[PDB]
């Protein structure tokens, strides 16, 4: 199923997934696809934090759904 992912800097990546995946699984095709580190990741979908252990279905994420990835960078 394709999902939307939109970022802080109105850039939207569209991945493919399934709802068994797990949210570090997720992370790791945004590495892949971005180059953003899954450990400066943070990952919203109807205003819950998404946890790494817990698939897409845990949420009730559906096809064509719209995460909110916001940066947490390690320094400042």
Do not use: C, W
Not at 4 to 30: C, M, Q, R, Y
Not at 33 to 47: C, N, V
Request: charged letters at 30%; glycine letters at 8%; zero cysteines.
């Amino acid at each position: 199923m394709q999902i939307f992912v939109k970022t802080l800097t109105g850039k939207t990546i569209t991945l493919e997934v399934e709802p068994s995946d797990t949210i570090e699984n997720v992370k790791a095709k945004i590495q892949d696809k971005e180059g953003i580190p899954p450990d400066q990741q943070r990952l919203i979908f109807a205003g819950k934090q998404l946890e790494d252990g817990r698939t897409l279905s845990d949420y009730n994420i559906q096809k064509e759904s719209t995460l909110h990835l916001v940066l947490r960078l390690r320094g400042g």
